[PDB]
Design an enzyme around this catalytic site. Sequence first.
Site, PDB file in Angstrom:
ATOM      1  N   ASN A   1       0.830  -1.196   0.000  1.00  0.00           N
ATOM      2  CA  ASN A   1       0.000   0.000   0.000  1.00  0.00           C
ATOM      3  C   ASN A   1       0.868   1.251   0.000  1.00  0.00           C
ATOM      4  OD1 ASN A   1      -0.459   1.903   2.638  1.00  0.00           O
ATOM      5  ND2 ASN A   1       0.393  -0.089   3.233  1.00  0.00           N
TER       6      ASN A   1
ATOM      7  N   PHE B   1      -1.698   8.719   4.034  1.00  0.00           N
ATOM      8  CA  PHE B   1      -2.461   9.400   5.080  1.00  0.00           C
ATOM      9  C   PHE B   1      -3.684  10.114   4.493  1.00  0.00           C
ATOM     10  CE2 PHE B   1       0.448   7.759   7.691  1.00  0.00           C
ATOM     11  CZ  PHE B   1       1.471   8.520   8.222  1.00  0.00           C
TER      12      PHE B   1
ATOM     13  N   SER C   1       9.612   7.060   8.351  1.00  0.00           N
ATOM     14  CA  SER C   1      10.401   5.958   7.836  1.00  0.00           C
ATOM     15  C   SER C   1      11.508   6.486   6.932  1.00  0.00           C
ATOM     16  CB  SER C   1       9.519   4.984   7.059  1.00  0.00           C
ATOM     17  OG  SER C   1      10.300   4.010   6.387  1.00  0.00           O
TER      18      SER C   1
ATOM     19  N   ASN D   1      12.224   6.119   4.066  1.00  0.00           N
ATOM     20  CA  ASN D   1      11.791   5.661   2.749  1.00  0.00           C
ATOM     21  C   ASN D   1      11.875   6.743   1.682  1.00  0.00           C
ATOM     22  N   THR D   2      11.590   7.991   2.041  1.00  0.00           N
ATOM     23  CA  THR D   2      11.529   9.081   1.079  1.00  0.00           C
ATOM     24  C   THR D   2      11.646  10.395   1.839  1.00  0.00           C
TER      25      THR D   2
ATOM     26  N   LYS E   1       5.542   4.896  17.224  1.00  0.00           N
ATOM     27  CA  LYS E   1       5.512   3.793  16.273  1.00  0.00           C
ATOM     28  C   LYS E   1       6.635   3.982  15.261  1.00  0.00           C
ATOM     29  CE  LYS E   1       2.361   1.203  13.276  1.00  0.00           C
ATOM     30  NZ  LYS E   1       0.947   1.082  12.824  1.00  0.00           N
TER      31      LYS E   1
ATOM     32  N   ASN F   1       5.965  -0.721  11.685  1.00  0.00           N
ATOM     33  CA  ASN F   1       5.120  -0.392  10.543  1.00  0.00           C
ATOM     34  C   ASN F   1       5.457  -1.311   9.372  1.00  0.00           C
ATOM     35  OD1 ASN F   1       3.503   1.035   8.554  1.00  0.00           O
ATOM     36  ND2 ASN F   1       3.631   2.827   9.899  1.00  0.00           N
TER      37      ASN F   1
END
Length: 354
Positions: free
Chosen positions: A115, A119, A179, A181-182, A217, A248
Amino acid sequence: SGNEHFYKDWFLPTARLLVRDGETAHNLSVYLASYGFIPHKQRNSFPQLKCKVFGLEFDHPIGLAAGFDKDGKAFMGLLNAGFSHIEVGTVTPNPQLGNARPRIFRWTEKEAVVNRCGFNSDGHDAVYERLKDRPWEGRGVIGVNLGCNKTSADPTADYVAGVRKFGEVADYLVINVSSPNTPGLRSLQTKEKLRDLLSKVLAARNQLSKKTPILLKISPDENDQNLKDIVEVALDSKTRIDGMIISNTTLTTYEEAVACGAAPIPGNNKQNVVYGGLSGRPLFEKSTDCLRKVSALTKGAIPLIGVGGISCGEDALSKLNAGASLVQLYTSFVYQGPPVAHKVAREINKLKMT
Ligand SMILES: Cc1cc2nc3c(=O)[nH]c(=O)nc-3n(C[C@H](O)[C@H](O)[C@H](O)COP(=O)(O)O)c2cc1C
Ligand SMILES: O=C1C(O)=C(Nc2ccc(F)cc2)C(=O)c2ccccc21
Protein backbone atom coordinates in the site's frame (compact mmCIF):
# COMPACT_ATOMS: atom_id res chain seq x y z
CA SER A 1 -11.09 -24.32 12.07
CA GLY A 2 -14.89 -24.52 11.86
CA ASN A 3 -16.53 -21.14 11.28
CA GLU A 4 -13.05 -19.73 10.57
CA HIS A 5 -12.33 -21.70 7.39
CA PHE A 6 -15.58 -20.35 5.90
CA TYR A 7 -13.90 -16.95 5.43
CA LYS A 8 -10.32 -17.90 4.53
CA ASP A 9 -11.46 -20.55 2.02
CA TRP A 10 -14.99 -19.68 0.82
CA PHE A 11 -16.19 -16.12 1.51
CA LEU A 12 -13.10 -13.94 1.08
CA PRO A 13 -11.75 -15.56 -2.15
CA THR A 14 -15.13 -15.05 -3.83
CA ALA A 15 -15.25 -11.47 -2.55
CA ARG A 16 -11.79 -10.81 -3.99
CA LEU A 17 -13.04 -12.23 -7.30
CA LEU A 18 -15.99 -9.82 -7.23
CA VAL A 19 -14.26 -6.70 -5.87
CA ARG A 20 -10.93 -6.74 -7.70
CA ASP A 21 -9.75 -3.39 -6.30
CA GLY A 22 -8.40 -3.57 -2.77
CA GLU A 23 -9.39 -0.12 -1.52
CA THR A 24 -12.95 -0.61 -2.78
CA ALA A 25 -13.30 -3.77 -0.69
CA HIS A 26 -11.76 -1.84 2.21
CA ASN A 27 -14.40 0.90 1.97
CA LEU A 28 -17.13 -1.74 1.72
CA SER A 29 -16.07 -3.66 4.84
CA VAL A 30 -15.77 -0.42 6.82
CA TYR A 31 -19.27 0.45 5.60
CA LEU A 32 -20.54 -2.92 6.85
CA ALA A 33 -18.80 -2.76 10.23
CA SER A 34 -20.16 0.76 10.82
CA TYR A 35 -23.76 -0.53 10.76
CA GLY A 36 -23.10 -3.68 12.80
CA PHE A 37 -23.15 -6.17 9.89
CA ILE A 38 -20.25 -8.10 11.41
CA PRO A 39 -20.01 -11.29 13.52
CA HIS A 40 -19.90 -10.33 17.19
CA LYS A 41 -17.87 -12.13 19.85
CA GLN A 42 -18.34 -12.42 23.60
CA ARG A 43 -15.87 -10.66 25.88
CA ASN A 44 -14.32 -12.27 28.98
CA SER A 45 -13.91 -15.42 26.85
CA PHE A 46 -10.18 -15.75 27.69
CA PRO A 47 -9.65 -15.30 31.45
CA GLN A 48 -5.99 -16.35 31.27
CA LEU A 49 -5.26 -13.72 28.59
CA LYS A 50 -6.60 -10.61 30.36
CA CYS A 51 -3.81 -8.08 30.85
CA LYS A 52 -3.21 -4.57 32.19
CA VAL A 53 -1.18 -2.15 30.05
CA PHE A 54 -0.89 1.57 30.86
CA GLY A 55 -3.25 0.84 33.74
CA LEU A 56 -5.95 -0.20 31.26
CA GLU A 57 -7.79 -3.53 31.30
CA PHE A 58 -7.51 -5.52 28.06
CA ASP A 59 -9.66 -8.55 27.27
CA HIS A 60 -6.63 -9.98 25.43
CA PRO A 61 -3.38 -8.58 23.97
CA ILE A 62 -4.73 -8.72 20.38
CA GLY A 63 -5.99 -5.54 18.73
CA LEU A 64 -6.45 -3.96 15.31
CA ALA A 65 -3.55 -1.87 14.04
CA ALA A 66 -3.91 1.63 12.65
CA GLY A 67 -4.96 2.33 9.07
CA PHE A 68 -8.13 0.24 8.94
CA ASP A 69 -10.53 2.55 10.80
CA LYS A 70 -8.82 5.71 9.58
CA ASP A 71 -11.83 7.91 10.39
CA GLY A 72 -13.30 6.17 13.45
CA LYS A 73 -16.43 5.04 11.60
CA ALA A 74 -16.49 1.36 12.64
CA PHE A 75 -14.43 0.91 15.84
CA MET A 76 -17.52 -0.20 17.79
CA GLY A 77 -18.31 -3.09 15.47
CA LEU A 78 -14.64 -4.06 15.35
CA LEU A 79 -14.44 -4.13 19.15
CA ASN A 80 -17.54 -6.35 19.17
CA ALA A 81 -15.92 -8.46 16.44
CA GLY A 82 -13.22 -9.74 18.80
CA PHE A 83 -10.39 -7.20 18.91
CA SER A 84 -9.57 -5.92 22.38
CA HIS A 85 -8.45 -2.50 21.13
CA ILE A 86 -8.75 -0.46 17.93
CA GLU A 87 -6.17 2.14 16.86
CA VAL A 88 -8.10 4.83 15.00
CA GLY A 89 -5.89 6.68 12.54
CA THR A 90 -3.84 7.93 11.03
CA VAL A 91 -5.64 11.26 11.53
CA THR A 92 -4.25 14.53 10.14
CA PRO A 93 -5.25 18.05 11.27
CA ASN A 94 -6.85 19.08 7.98
CA PRO A 95 -8.87 16.70 5.78
CA GLN A 96 -6.44 15.10 3.33
CA LEU A 97 -6.93 13.26 0.06
CA GLY A 98 -3.74 11.18 0.01
CA ASN A 99 -1.77 9.72 -2.85
CA ALA A 100 -3.30 8.88 -6.21
CA ARG A 101 -5.34 5.67 -6.70
CA PRO A 102 -4.90 2.76 -7.12
CA ARG A 103 -2.78 2.77 -3.95
CA ILE A 104 -3.57 -0.69 -2.50
CA PHE A 105 -2.54 -4.02 -4.04
CA ARG A 106 -3.08 -7.60 -2.86
CA TRP A 107 -0.30 -10.20 -2.90
CA THR A 108 -2.45 -13.24 -2.18
CA GLU A 109 0.31 -15.72 -3.07
CA LYS A 110 2.12 -14.64 0.13
CA GLU A 111 -0.89 -13.34 2.13
CA ALA A 112 0.61 -9.85 1.85
CA VAL A 113 -0.48 -6.32 0.94
CA VAL A 114 1.47 -3.45 -0.64
CA ASN A 115 0.00 0.00 0.00
CA ARG A 116 0.95 3.64 -0.58
CA CYS A 117 -2.14 5.43 0.75
CA GLY A 118 -0.32 8.50 2.04
CA PHE A 119 -2.46 9.40 5.08
CA ASN A 120 -5.98 9.82 3.71
CA SER A 121 -7.94 11.22 6.65
CA ASP A 122 -11.10 13.23 7.31
CA GLY A 123 -9.27 15.68 9.59
CA HIS A 124 -9.17 16.22 13.33
CA ASP A 125 -12.69 17.62 13.68
CA ALA A 126 -14.53 14.94 11.69
CA VAL A 127 -12.83 12.06 13.51
CA TYR A 128 -13.12 13.77 16.91
CA GLU A 129 -16.89 14.07 16.49
CA ARG A 130 -17.01 10.27 16.24
CA LEU A 131 -14.92 9.70 19.40
CA LYS A 132 -15.99 12.48 21.80
CA ASP A 133 -18.64 10.60 23.80
CA ARG A 134 -16.35 7.58 24.39
CA PRO A 135 -19.03 5.00 23.47
CA TRP A 136 -16.50 2.16 23.91
CA GLU A 137 -16.36 2.71 27.69
CA GLY A 138 -16.09 -0.69 29.33
CA ARG A 139 -16.20 -2.45 25.94
CA GLY A 140 -12.54 -2.09 24.95
CA VAL A 141 -9.68 0.33 24.39
CA ILE A 142 -9.38 2.95 21.64
CA GLY A 143 -6.15 4.64 20.63
CA VAL A 144 -5.59 7.47 18.14
CA ASN A 145 -2.67 7.57 15.71
CA LEU A 146 -1.70 11.17 14.96
CA GLY A 147 -0.16 12.42 11.73
CA CYS A 148 0.67 15.57 9.80
CA ASN A 149 -0.65 17.01 6.56
CA LYS A 150 1.32 16.80 3.33
CA THR A 151 1.38 20.59 2.85
CA SER A 152 2.17 21.24 6.52
CA ALA A 153 4.61 24.01 7.43
CA ASP A 154 5.62 22.67 10.86
CA PRO A 155 4.86 18.92 11.14
CA THR A 156 5.65 18.88 14.86
CA ALA A 157 2.91 21.49 15.32
CA ASP A 158 0.48 19.07 13.64
CA TYR A 159 1.44 16.30 16.07
CA VAL A 160 1.06 18.70 19.01
CA ALA A 161 -2.36 19.78 17.73
CA GLY A 162 -3.37 16.12 17.56
CA VAL A 163 -2.22 15.50 21.13
CA ARG A 164 -4.32 18.45 22.30
CA LYS A 165 -7.30 17.39 20.17
CA PHE A 166 -7.62 13.72 21.15
CA GLY A 167 -5.72 13.63 24.45
CA GLU A 168 -8.91 13.90 26.51
CA VAL A 169 -11.01 11.24 24.76
CA ALA A 170 -8.42 8.66 23.61
CA ASP A 171 -7.05 5.93 25.85
CA TYR A 172 -3.62 6.32 24.23
CA LEU A 173 -1.97 8.36 21.48
CA VAL A 174 0.54 7.22 18.86
CA ILE A 175 3.02 9.17 16.73
CA ASN A 176 4.65 7.59 13.68
CA VAL A 177 8.40 8.03 13.31
CA SER A 178 9.19 9.01 9.73
CA SER A 179 10.40 5.96 7.84
CA PRO A 180 13.72 6.26 5.99
CA ASN A 181 11.79 5.66 2.75
CA THR A 182 11.53 9.08 1.08
CA PRO A 183 12.00 12.80 1.81
CA GLY A 184 8.21 12.97 2.24
CA LEU A 185 8.01 14.07 5.88
CA ARG A 186 11.68 13.16 6.36
CA SER A 187 12.52 16.61 7.75
CA LEU A 188 12.29 14.96 11.20
CA GLN A 189 14.70 12.13 10.31
CA THR A 190 17.50 13.34 12.61
CA LYS A 191 18.05 12.68 16.30
CA GLU A 192 17.52 16.29 17.40
CA LYS A 193 14.32 16.83 15.39
CA LEU A 194 12.91 13.74 17.11
CA ARG A 195 13.97 15.06 20.53
CA ASP A 196 12.40 18.41 19.63
CA LEU A 197 9.20 16.68 18.52
CA LEU A 198 8.92 14.60 21.70
CA SER A 199 9.66 17.65 23.86
CA LYS A 200 6.81 19.70 22.41
CA VAL A 201 4.48 16.69 22.34
CA LEU A 202 5.09 15.88 26.02
CA ALA A 203 4.58 19.54 26.93
CA ALA A 204 1.17 19.50 25.23
CA ARG A 205 0.43 16.15 26.89
CA ASN A 206 1.17 17.61 30.33
CA GLN A 207 -1.27 20.46 29.61
CA LEU A 208 -4.10 17.90 29.68
CA SER A 209 -6.19 16.89 32.68
CA LYS A 210 -4.84 13.32 32.51
CA LYS A 211 -1.34 12.21 31.50
CA THR A 212 -2.54 10.33 28.43
CA PRO A 213 -0.06 7.65 27.29
CA ILE A 214 2.12 8.70 24.35
CA LEU A 215 3.39 5.89 22.12
CA LEU A 216 5.97 6.01 19.34
CA LYS A 217 5.51 3.79 16.27
CA ILE A 218 8.69 3.08 14.31
CA SER A 219 9.75 1.41 11.03
CA PRO A 220 11.53 -1.98 10.85
CA ASP A 221 14.01 -0.62 8.27
CA GLU A 222 16.03 1.50 10.71
CA ASN A 223 19.68 0.50 10.98
CA ASP A 224 21.23 -0.42 14.33
CA GLN A 225 22.57 3.05 15.16
CA ASN A 226 19.39 4.98 14.34
CA LEU A 227 17.36 2.37 16.23
CA LYS A 228 19.51 3.01 19.31
CA ASP A 229 19.10 6.77 18.88
CA ILE A 230 15.31 6.48 18.78
CA VAL A 231 15.33 4.37 21.96
CA GLU A 232 17.69 6.79 23.70
CA VAL A 233 15.54 9.86 23.02
CA ALA A 234 12.39 7.91 23.91
CA LEU A 235 13.85 6.99 27.32
CA ASP A 236 15.55 10.28 28.26
CA SER A 237 14.01 11.81 31.38
CA LYS A 238 13.37 15.12 29.60
CA THR A 239 11.56 13.40 26.68
CA ARG A 240 10.37 10.09 28.16
CA ILE A 241 7.43 8.51 26.32
CA ASP A 242 5.19 5.72 27.62
CA GLY A 243 5.59 2.93 25.06
CA MET A 244 6.58 1.97 21.54
CA ILE A 245 4.96 0.14 18.63
CA ILE A 246 7.13 -2.16 16.50
CA SER A 247 6.58 -1.89 13.72
CA ASN A 248 5.12 -0.39 10.54
CA THR A 249 5.62 -1.59 6.95
CA THR A 250 8.80 -2.36 5.01
CA LEU A 251 9.81 -0.69 1.75
CA THR A 252 8.91 -3.07 -1.07
CA THR A 253 11.46 -4.08 -3.68
CA TYR A 254 10.83 -3.92 -7.42
CA GLU A 255 10.39 -7.69 -7.75
CA GLU A 256 7.97 -7.80 -4.82
CA ALA A 257 5.98 -4.92 -6.33
CA VAL A 258 5.59 -6.31 -9.86
CA ALA A 259 4.27 -9.59 -8.43
CA CYS A 260 1.16 -7.89 -7.02
CA GLY A 261 0.63 -4.96 -9.41
CA ALA A 262 2.28 -2.28 -7.26
CA ALA A 263 4.82 -1.71 -10.06
CA PRO A 264 5.04 -0.01 -12.42
CA ILE A 265 3.36 3.24 -11.34
CA PRO A 266 1.17 4.64 -14.15
CA GLY A 267 2.85 7.86 -15.25
CA ASN A 268 6.15 7.48 -13.36
CA ASN A 269 9.31 6.56 -15.27
CA LYS A 270 11.83 7.41 -12.53
CA GLN A 271 13.48 4.53 -10.68
CA ASN A 272 13.96 6.39 -7.37
CA VAL A 273 10.30 5.86 -6.53
CA VAL A 274 8.59 4.34 -3.49
CA TYR A 275 6.23 1.61 -4.67
CA GLY A 276 4.73 1.20 -1.20
CA GLY A 277 5.02 -0.65 2.09
CA LEU A 278 4.88 -4.43 2.42
CA SER A 279 2.62 -5.83 5.14
CA GLY A 280 1.56 -9.39 5.86
CA ARG A 281 3.35 -12.66 6.50
CA PRO A 282 6.62 -11.66 4.71
CA LEU A 283 6.95 -8.95 7.39
CA PHE A 284 6.76 -11.16 10.49
CA GLU A 285 10.41 -12.25 10.55
CA LYS A 286 11.85 -8.74 10.23
CA SER A 287 9.37 -6.84 12.42
CA THR A 288 9.82 -9.42 15.19
CA ASP A 289 13.62 -9.18 15.11
CA CYS A 290 13.34 -5.39 15.27
CA LEU A 291 11.03 -5.77 18.27
CA ARG A 292 13.49 -8.14 19.94
CA LYS A 293 16.20 -5.50 19.44
CA VAL A 294 14.17 -2.59 20.86
CA SER A 295 13.10 -4.66 23.87
CA ALA A 296 16.79 -5.21 24.63
CA LEU A 297 17.70 -1.53 24.23
CA THR A 298 14.87 -0.37 26.50
CA LYS A 299 15.70 -3.07 29.10
CA GLY A 300 11.95 -3.66 29.30
CA ALA A 301 11.29 -0.23 30.81
CA ILE A 302 8.30 0.71 28.63
CA PRO A 303 5.50 -1.47 27.19
CA LEU A 304 5.82 -2.58 23.57
CA ILE A 305 3.21 -3.45 20.95
CA GLY A 306 4.34 -6.08 18.46
CA VAL A 307 2.79 -5.50 15.04
CA GLY A 308 3.53 -7.05 11.67
CA GLY A 309 2.78 -10.36 10.01
CA ILE A 310 0.70 -11.96 12.77
CA SER A 311 -1.38 -14.66 11.06
CA CYS A 312 -1.74 -17.32 13.80
CA GLY A 313 -1.25 -17.74 17.53
CA GLU A 314 2.43 -18.71 17.56
CA ASP A 315 3.31 -15.49 15.72
CA ALA A 316 1.72 -13.38 18.45
CA LEU A 317 3.35 -15.56 21.11
CA SER A 318 6.73 -15.02 19.44
CA LYS A 319 6.24 -11.25 19.68
CA LEU A 320 4.97 -11.44 23.27
CA ASN A 321 7.96 -13.55 24.29
CA ALA A 322 10.29 -11.16 22.43
CA GLY A 323 9.25 -8.29 24.71
CA ALA A 324 5.83 -7.14 23.55
CA SER A 325 2.94 -6.54 25.95
CA LEU A 326 0.31 -6.06 23.22
CA VAL A 327 -0.02 -7.25 19.62
CA GLN A 328 -1.80 -5.83 16.57
CA LEU A 329 -2.62 -7.06 13.07
CA TYR A 330 -4.09 -5.83 9.80
CA THR A 331 -3.26 -7.92 6.73
CA SER A 332 -4.30 -11.23 8.31
CA PHE A 333 -7.68 -9.61 8.96
CA VAL A 334 -7.98 -9.11 5.20
CA TYR A 335 -7.15 -12.75 4.39
CA GLN A 336 -8.88 -14.41 7.38
CA GLY A 337 -11.82 -12.12 8.18
CA PRO A 338 -13.44 -11.32 11.54
CA PRO A 339 -12.64 -14.68 13.21
CA VAL A 340 -8.92 -13.79 13.09
CA ALA A 341 -9.38 -11.77 16.29
CA HIS A 342 -10.45 -14.68 18.51
CA LYS A 343 -8.66 -17.34 16.45
CA VAL A 344 -5.21 -16.07 17.45
CA ALA A 345 -6.42 -15.68 21.04
CA ARG A 346 -7.57 -19.31 21.15
CA GLU A 347 -4.22 -20.55 19.84
CA ILE A 348 -2.26 -18.49 22.38
CA ASN A 349 -4.33 -19.94 25.22
CA LYS A 350 -3.61 -23.44 23.89
CA LEU A 351 0.15 -22.85 23.66
CA LYS A 352 0.47 -21.63 27.26
CA MET A 353 -1.18 -24.80 28.64
CA THR A 354 1.80 -27.15 28.51
C1 LIG B 1 -3.64 -0.35 3.69
C2 LIG B 1 -2.83 -0.04 4.92
C3 LIG B 1 -2.96 1.20 5.54
C4 LIG B 1 -2.21 1.49 6.68
N1 LIG B 1 -2.35 2.73 7.28
C5 LIG B 1 -1.61 3.02 8.41
C6 LIG B 1 -1.75 4.26 9.02
O1 LIG B 1 -2.52 5.10 8.56
N2 LIG B 1 -1.01 4.55 10.15
C7 LIG B 1 -0.14 3.62 10.67
O2 LIG B 1 0.52 3.89 11.68
N3 LIG B 1 0.00 2.39 10.06
C8 LIG B 1 -0.74 2.08 8.93
N4 LIG B 1 -0.60 0.85 8.33
C9 LIG B 1 0.36 -0.15 8.91
C10 LIG B 1 -0.36 -1.06 9.90
O3 LIG B 1 -1.01 -0.29 10.88
C11 LIG B 1 0.63 -2.00 10.59
O4 LIG B 1 1.69 -1.24 11.14
C12 LIG B 1 1.20 -3.04 9.64
O5 LIG B 1 0.33 -3.26 8.55
C13 LIG B 1 1.38 -4.34 10.40
O6 LIG B 1 1.66 -5.41 9.52
P1 LIG B 1 0.59 -6.60 9.40
O7 LIG B 1 -0.69 -6.04 8.82
O8 LIG B 1 1.14 -7.64 8.46
O9 LIG B 1 0.31 -7.20 10.76
C14 LIG B 1 -1.34 0.55 7.20
C15 LIG B 1 -1.21 -0.69 6.58
C16 LIG B 1 -1.95 -0.98 5.44
C17 LIG B 1 -1.81 -2.32 4.77
O1 LIG C 1 -9.62 -3.56 4.17
C1 LIG C 1 -9.67 -4.41 3.30
C2 LIG C 1 -10.89 -5.28 3.22
O2 LIG C 1 -11.87 -4.99 4.07
C3 LIG C 1 -10.94 -6.34 2.29
N1 LIG C 1 -11.93 -7.25 2.36
C4 LIG C 1 -12.53 -7.78 3.54
C5 LIG C 1 -11.78 -7.94 4.70
C6 LIG C 1 -12.36 -8.44 5.85
C7 LIG C 1 -13.69 -8.76 5.83
F1 LIG C 1 -14.26 -9.25 6.96
C8 LIG C 1 -14.47 -8.60 4.72
C9 LIG C 1 -13.88 -8.10 3.56
C10 LIG C 1 -9.87 -6.45 1.23
O3 LIG C 1 -10.00 -7.31 0.32
C11 LIG C 1 -8.69 -5.58 1.33
C12 LIG C 1 -7.65 -5.74 0.42
C13 LIG C 1 -6.53 -4.94 0.49
C14 LIG C 1 -6.43 -3.97 1.48
C15 LIG C 1 -7.45 -3.80 2.39
C16 LIG C 1 -8.59 -4.60 2.32
